[PDB]
Design brief:
CATH superfamily of chain A: L-arginine/glycine Amidinotransferase, Chain A
Strand order of the largest sheet of chain A: 4-1-19
Number of strands of chain A: 19
Radius of gyration of chain A: 19 Å
Strand content of chain A: 15-25%
Number of helices of chain A: 6
Largest sheet of chain A: 3 strands, mixed
Order of helices and strands of chain A: EEHEHEEEEEHEEEHEEEEEEHEHE
Structural class of chain A: alpha/beta
Oligomer: homodimer
CATH topology of chain A: L-arginine/glycine Amidinotransferase, Chain A
Distance between the termini of chain A: 32 Å
Largest interface: A-B, 35 and 33 residues
Chain lengths: 348, 348
């Protein structure tokens, strides 16, 4: 009886992983971090604000983070947190050198598709050994019958990046690279956004690793530059929330065309602490569905909670203050390893 | 029509990978290299002879290596060679730091079980990014329909090693670790030698990655301390060559008990250049079967060539002079990516 059993984004959550803010940082300046994350706000990679986030943001989001875990426990969910890791410790391969990121977004490079966990081949050199903080959880999952796979570790030479190109095109297609957060899971159907943090070869590879049961749907016309997370948010079978500045009627994936679609209201601008914000105001949409009638939304998105309730979706409004600074909402900041339920196909 | 299709050790070779001696070195002294390779000849890891092998050995084996590629080409096999890589370039993770090994033994950390290639989780930190020299080949294989997987990259902390234990017990069982060269492939049945370069969890993991079709047979009573390569040598279905100092009648794996077994004659001691030899005289047995009736054997093993011919096995005797120095025979120094044939079960 594997501990990892999960087929979609909305069934009744049994066990999740939450994630800390403890040594969060901005890696050293570098082609890849520049090309995938900051080459739209800064003139050159040497202007990226490398360094550790201010203590105030890590303190405050760590207590917010404690509340999330607390309430999910109250709801009956089993909460697991990351192991300790130094993010300033250097990582160095024959081709390049860097420091680490943070362990605030477990969603990003760990993908759970059934009884299997896949360590994806992340676009950023700093996240080269992303799963190191989770070795003990994984090991336990493994010893319980969960299948545990990894994608080949990428070369990630200068040629895989294209700072100067237009957005959603600065990640070349030389090898399978993709963050897990570029994939969304609707049972058999797997949606894969091809953008600045995941190429075509990555979805080529994603398909072979999960096999014929599932069908990977790569998308290159949505305007997400990086993760699908705050662009398409499924809520229960047959109802999906979309980002109106990005997805439209000529956009929408084909297997989702039958689901009823509710357009997100324009969000409140929670602030940002910095020079330039790290995330678009659309992390307001980064919600986490607990069961088909329960979802966690930031309590300042009163337009958004209203709407969700109008469609018979009860909310539990918690708050993540530094979301635009660290770039992570409830979904980015969690990883669901088991939801009660079975494997099905939602095309109506 | 994937370029990677191979079910066993002896069917008719179509495409192989050969491998250079170009920048071969002995890594910097370190717990893992000491525990898995030198802790039976040296008093402590600080005595290991780190450094680049003498030019004479690399020059001479590289021309010998040119002849091997030349003759297999003559036989109609497609020969591919590794890419260029600096082995002195440092590799550094949060836990440790090192320089690389060599790209002379493609067999060791790349496993081809059907249409799939598995980058195994190598026991030595210097071989942490073993597959980097092969990125372009694998990329091509990948783009051709071959399934391309990797085992989770190991933490490989001080806890996974046990210098002071008896041989075949200095690699603890904390996480799936195992070199591909610890596995031997007889179609459905996969023999996995559990020893100093591969644990029980590695075979636990190996089973999950390949699935129910195959059955992994872990072995802890053969006396190989590292690789199964020069201990059990299948030659054609129903005939296996065994190492008499290691395997016997109370040893032999159960699915092999029906195959007829021929005992290896005592070999010629080709020399070693160094202080202490790097491989046992039994690399004389590291032969490479090209087809069921053709095998490549070092031409100084005249007892062995005779015997093989006695059992209707034709040999093509080439020579690898520095085999006890670099530790690689014809099998260690090659990687077969495709043999003409199909998937079967040889239990008679």
């Amino acid at each position: 009886r594997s501990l990892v059993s999960v087929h979609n984004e909305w069934d009744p959550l049994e066990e999740v992983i939450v994630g800390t803010a403890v040594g969060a940082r901005v890696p050293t300046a570098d082609r890849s971090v520049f090309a995938v994350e900051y080459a739209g706000d800064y003139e050159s990679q040497e202007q990226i604000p490398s360094g550790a986030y201010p203590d105030r943001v890590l303190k405050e989001t760590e207590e917010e983070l404690h509340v999330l875990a607390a309430e999910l426990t109250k709801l009956g969910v089993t909460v697991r947190r990351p192991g300790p890791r130094d993010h300033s410790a250097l990582i160095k391969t024959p081709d390049w050198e860097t420091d680490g990121f943070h362990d605030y977004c477990p969603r990003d490079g760990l993908l759970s598709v059934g009884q299997t966990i896949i360590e994806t081949p992340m676009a950023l050199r700093s996240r080269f050994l992303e799963s190191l903080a989770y070795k003990d959880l994984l090991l336990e999952y493994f010893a319980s019958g969960s299948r545990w796979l990894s994608a080949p570790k990428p070369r990630l030479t200068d040629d895989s990046y294209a700072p100067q190109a237009p957005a959603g095109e600065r990640l070349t297609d030389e090898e399978p690279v993709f963050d897990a957060a570029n994939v969304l899971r609707f049972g058999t159907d797997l949606l894969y956004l091809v953008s600045d943090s995941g190429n075509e070869l990555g979805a080529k590879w994603l398909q072979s690793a999960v096999g014929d049961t599932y069908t990977v749907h790569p998308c290159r016309k949505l305007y997400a530059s990086t993760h699908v997370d705050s662009t398409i948010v499924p809520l229960r079978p047959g109802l999906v929330l979309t980002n109106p500045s990005r997805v439209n009627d000529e956009n929408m994936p084909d297997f989702l065309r039958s689901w009823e679609n509710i357009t997100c209201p324009e969000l409140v601008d929670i602030g940002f602490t910095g020079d330039k914000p790290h995330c678009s105001v659309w992390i307001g949409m980064n919600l986490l569905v607990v069961r088909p009638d329960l979802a966690v939304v930031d309590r300042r998105q009163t337009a958004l909670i209203r709407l969700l309730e109008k469609h018979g979706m009860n909310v539990l409004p918690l708050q993540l203050t530094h979301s635009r600074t660290l770039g992570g909402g409830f979904h980015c900041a969690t990883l669901d390893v088991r939801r009660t339920g079975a494997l099905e196909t939602y095309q109506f």
